[PDB]
């Protein structure tokens, strides 16, 4: 049908990192794109979520919740949303499997209407059709969202990248993206996390090969520090462990929720009886094991500080152990890294150097964001998922790719972008904020 009004409203993910949540309204129908949390600005063990009081005041029109990927930045606030509102949850195979976990983990029995979607799904509503396309990210079964209106598509990319080595459940949809482009994009909502970094990311194959060559020189025990969110990195050391006749052991007695669900669903490639439990590590010589230390915020680095300063509940460093920090150093956590480096050197461990000519990220750098802009060729553009400078960087790339400058909108949380059908205006503000927990 001919649509009249379009509204686009960020309640999270702008003027901050993480906590994606973008409200889109087409006439009398509202769609919530992602529902993320955020860890509180520079103490662990607590979470922040968006203020959905605007959604609650218009709860009769919320036709669903669409989840791009299974990161806490996309699904971390779903449970809390669902306490206050009943509405159907759309996501990929994995994304849904993990939302279910998050619910069971908070001992919530309330039944939820789930729909598993894929890149061939076309979910039909009264005014609009929602479709999807595959994106490349650090977690598999990531999707973009496309809301078909008569003014054209409203595309939300989620978090995404363009990597030439990832080709599985990480493969991008060059073709349906190119289709979305021609059909015509009204508005593109894209991830500005690394819009400041020029050029491209380092391909994951290259990062893996660099890790291998370094890990091949280690004559004693090896400990690798990951984010739990970065399934690609996890996967990579598993590959390497196999190729060096080593075995892998995660910190703790139980494997991490996300990883273990995805493993059980067959997302990872793990040769049989490669994982040794943390119980049975002393049994094998130093040179036959990689220990993987995962975490959420800075826990990965916090964990190494305990393992060196001997005070780790589970296992500690001994002299001769080699260490690898498989994370990028944001300025936030540049401090506690250097503190921890010292503590590791005191403990008498070899720090495997981080190659400075490598830039590793879940998110497209400048040229990767221009890749997505050149394929969608959007009329209007709205950079999200970043601080103010990050959104500005992305805005400039949009201009470069031929988007009209007057049609590029930088928005704080609660800003409302309306479309009468003639002009697009930012002539309203609504309720938004941070809700600690
Ligand atoms: Mn992500």
Domain ranges of the chain: 6-198+361-436, 204-351
Question: What is the whole-number distance in angstroms between the Cα of residue 360 and the centre of ligand 1?
Answer: 13
β partners of residue 91? 116
Distance CA 99, CA 89 (A): 9
Distance CA 98, CA 70 (A): 6
Question: Is 362 labeled as ligand-binding?
Answer: yes
Experimental method: X-ray
CA geometry: angle 287, 291, 296, nearest 5 deg: 160
* Residues 426 and 419 sit within 8 Å (Cβ to Cβ): no
* CATH H superfamily, domain 204-351: Metallo-hydrolase/oxidoreductase (3.40.50.10710)
Residues 6+ apart with CB under 8 A from 339: 305
Q: How would you label 253-282 residue by residue, b for 16+ Cβ within 10 Å and e otherwise? A: eebbebbebbbeeebbebeeeebbebeebe
DSSP H helix total and E strand total for the chain: 12, 21
Question: Is 167 labeled as ligand-binding?
Answer: no
Q: Do domains 6-198+361-436 and 204-351 have the same CATH topology?
A: no
> CA–CA distance from 415 to each of 81, 126, 152 (Å)?
20, 26, 22
Distance CA 293, CA 223 (A): 7
Q: Which of 72, 108, 67, 118 is nearest to 91 (CA)?
A: 67
Question: What is the whole-number distance in angstroms between the Cα of residue 234 and the centre of ligand 1?
Answer: 15
Question: What is the whole-number distance in angstroms between the Cα of residue 35 and the centre of ligand 1?
Answer: 13
Question: Is 137 labeled as ligand-binding?
Answer: yes
Distance CA 257, CA 243 (A): 26
Question: Is 71 labeled as ligand-binding?
Answer: yes
What is the separation, in whole angstroms, between the first and last Cα of the chain?
Answer: 42
Tokens at 136, concatenated:
């490349």
Q: Which CATH architecture has domain 6-198+361-436?
A: 4-Layer Sandwich (3.60)
Question: What is the whole-number distance in angstroms between the Cα of residue 70 and the centre of ligand 1?
Answer: 8
Q: Is 414 helix (H, G, I), strand (E, B) or coil?
A: coil
For this experimental structure, what is the resolution in angstroms? 3.0
CB atoms within 10 A of CB 42: 11
Question: Which residues lie near ion ligand 1 (Cβ < 5 Å)?
Answer: 71, 159, 362
Tokens at 406, concatenated:
């007057």
- If phi over 0 gives left and psi between -120 and 50 gives alpha, with beta otherwise, what is residue 158? left
Question: Is 363 labeled as ligand-binding?
Answer: yes
């Amino acid at each position: 049908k001919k649509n009249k009004d379009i509204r686009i409203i960020p309640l999270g993910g702008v003027g901050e990192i993480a906590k994606n949540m973008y409200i889109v309204e087409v006439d009398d129908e509202m769609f919530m794109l992602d529902a993320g949390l955020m860890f509180p600005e520079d103490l662990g063990v607590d979470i922040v979520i968006p203020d959905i009081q605007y959604v609650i005041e218009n709860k009769e029109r919320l036709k669903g919740i669409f989840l791009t990927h299974g990161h806490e930045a996309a699904i971390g606030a779903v449970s809390y949303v669902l306490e206050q509102i009943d509405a159907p949850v759309y996501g990929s195979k994995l994304t849904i499997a993990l939302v279910k976990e998050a619910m069971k983990a908070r001992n919530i029995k309330k039944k939820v209407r789930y729909y598993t979607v894929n890149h061939d799904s076309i979910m039909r509503f009264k005014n609009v059709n929602v479709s999807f396309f595959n994106t490349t990210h650090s977690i598999p079964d990531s999707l973009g969202v496309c809301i078909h209106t008569s003014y054209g598509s409203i595309v939300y990319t989620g978090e995404f990248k363009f990597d030439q080595s990832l080709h599985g459940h990480y493969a991008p949809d060059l073709k349906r993206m190119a289709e979305i482009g021609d059909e015509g994009v009204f508005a593109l909502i894209s991830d500005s996390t690394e819009a400041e970094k020029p050029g491209y990311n380092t391909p994951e194959n290259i990062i893996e090969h660099h890790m291998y060559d370094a890990f091949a020189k280690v004559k004693g025990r090896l400990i690798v520090s990951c984010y739990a969110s970065n399934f690609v990195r996890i996967q990579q050391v598993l590959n390497i462990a196999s190729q060096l006749n080593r075995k892998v052991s995660f910190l703790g007695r139980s494997l991490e929720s996300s990883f273990n669900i995805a493993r059980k669903m067959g997302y990872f490639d793990i040769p049989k009886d490669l994982l040794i439990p943390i119980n049975e590590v002393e049994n094998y010589p130093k040179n036959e094991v990689i220990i993987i230390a995962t975490g959420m915020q800075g826990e990965p680095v916090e964990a190494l500080s305990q393992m060196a300063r001997k005070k780790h509940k589970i296992m500690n460093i001994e002299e001769g152990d080699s260490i690898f920090l498989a994370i990028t150093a944001s300025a936030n956590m540049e401090v506690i890294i250097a503190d921890t480096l010292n503590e590791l050197v005191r403990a008498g461990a070899h720090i495997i150097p981080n190659n400075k000519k490598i830039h590793a990220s879940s998110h497209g750098c400048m040229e990767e964001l221009k890749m997505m802009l050149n394929i969608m060729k959007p009329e209007y553009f709205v950079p999200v998922q970043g601080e103010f400078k990050m959104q500005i960087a992305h805005a400039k790339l949009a201009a470069e790719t031929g988007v009209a400058p007057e049609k590029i909108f930088l928005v704080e949380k609660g800003d409302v972008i309306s479309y009468n059908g003639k002009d697009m205006i930012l002539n309203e503000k609504v309720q938004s904020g941070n809700i600690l927990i």
